[model samples]
Target: GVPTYGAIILDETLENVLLVQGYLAKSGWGFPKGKVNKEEAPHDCAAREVFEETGFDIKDYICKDDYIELRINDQLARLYIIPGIPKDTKFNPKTRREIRNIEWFSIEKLPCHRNDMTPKSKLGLAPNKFFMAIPFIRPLRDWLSRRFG
Candidate 1:
């Protein structure tokens, strides 16, 4: 069996404004992501990684089929996106092993330069570009409003 991983594209909001944590990468910024553990479903892995990296639990994440393929270290990696995670849990990444640093960036203000990405990020330029183009498909606001309001 080949190794596959899941990632969560969490959207957090405070005071009616939306924000997302961009994990520091050598090349630029990216969402919380990691490889799937043994015998773990991709969605479960996504949820676990989201919690581990950001210290926040996604209450009602809408898992989408949107995926991207890339060759990392010559092994093919499949990246899945779980969008519109309800921010009901507070995260503390101080103890998490995979996370290096966390920074909140407005989804609308995500930096355009790949050089800003972390050098170790699995998300390459093609995936990032594909992700940015599908912002509305995630429906963060709609999910938040339904769950929080």
Candidate 2:
């Protein structure tokens, strides 16, 4: 099977975090991400999927190198960091396609325990594992906040 890569795009408003729901596919809440097309680099694929799924064009966005790999049914997948969306950009959900719902989530009150996976789980790592290694990623998030916030 071909390798698939995706990204978690973060768009922070003054009081909320932008999020989208899969309309036709899984119908779950998540950041924009998708499969990489042939001859496409992972970073390019990440940017492409974000626009295709969420309708937010990130023309100058950069993909973070710190990534997590997951293996399921012998397929290897990669998750990339996507950041810096225009504050006022609108997110129009793709019509009757993969994305059905799009909305802003409060950064302070992000939904927890939605469906099976927690928000932390959907971020990348396994829930328990991430909790165990919270010390590591915690600093990263802090850094991101300082850098971008």
Candidate 3:
């Protein structure tokens, strides 16, 4: 059986998208997501994960029809997009430090491509880049394409 991850596309139209730092140990940029627990339904695990990772209770949501199979990670995952995340919404990242904190950024300010490092990056001048692992990149691409296409 393949592992499953449920990801939430926390966005405000094309203007912005939500990302969080994984402070527990693996620090990087990515959407709110988590592994499927034993005997748990994919849908149930997804909802619980968003609240745990982003500190926002995700109630109303819709799922993308297709699952993005991330070959690099040996997993199958579904993407869930919730529209119009309130501007005033508060983020209370999980107490265990699993999810460091949350912030919003514009679609245009996506993480610098590995080869196209920002002027100040590890080159010693740029800000921290959002790591685009197979899990985060594919769904994010698929989700954005639906609207931007």
Candidate 4:
């Protein structure tokens, strides 16, 4: 489980974040990200993955000190926080087969966690399309509040 790197790109208004949809195992909307290459720096990997997934290079906007990282199932995922990108910026995946679509979503309207199955008394959260991104929503919101507000 190699480390993964990417970016949380926000629009100029700061209310929306870009998400990409993939197929099969990654068949859901999530921030643009992918595994880091051998000996590749984290920031570079973030830029590379984002460019490959959404055709947007974030190198200039990346701040070394600004990022959110999480460890899940022994894998480390780090997404650099990059804000102020305009929605009109062109985006097209380098490889169309891996990426199904790219779109912007309102951060306030996104679900931070999956719903519980109370009717069935299920012990776990129900399936959701945003499983990957859900883990970071609350943290991102808090980060924005502290940094921007």
**Which candidate leads in lDDT?**
4
Cα error of candidate 1 at position 50, Å: 1.3
Please give the TM-score that candidate 3 achieves against the real structure: 0.71
How would you encode candidate 3's per-residue C-alpha lDDT over 1-149 as one tens digit per residue?
45655554545565677777776345777767777877987767767888787767765664545344454455565656666777568877665547666788776657434443454454533334576342355456665688667
lDDT of 1: 0.49
- TM-score to native of every candidate shown: 0.47, 0.59, 0.71, 0.97
lDDT, candidate 1, at 20: 31
Candidate 4 minimal-lDDT segment of 10 residues: 121-130
- Backbone clashes in model 3: 3
Candidate 1 per-residue lDDT over residues 1-149, each given as its tens digit: 35545443544443222223333442333455566777887667766766666666653653455555445456545545444545454556644444455554454454333343356675545445324223332454444456566
Off by over 4 Å in 3: 64-69, 116-128, 132-143, 147-149
User: What are the clash counts of all predictions, listed in order?
Assistant: 13, 1, 3, 0
- Please report the TM-score between candidate 2 and the true structure: 0.59
> Which prediction has more favorable lDDT, 1 or 3?
3
Off by over 4 Å in 1: 1-4, 8-28, 64-73, 76-89, 94-97, 111-149
Give one digit per residue, the lDDT tens place, for model 4 in 76-136. 9999999999999999999998999999999999999899989997788888999889999
Candidates arranged by lDDT, highest first = 4, 3, 2, 1
- Candidate lDDT (C-alpha), each: 0.49, 0.56, 0.63, 0.94
Task: Give one digit per residue, the lDDT tens place, for model 2 in 1-149.
Answer: 67766554556443444566664345556655567787888877866776777777654666466555556568766656555555677777454456677776554454332234465555543333112122223343554577666
Superposition error at 145 for model 4 (Å): 0.5
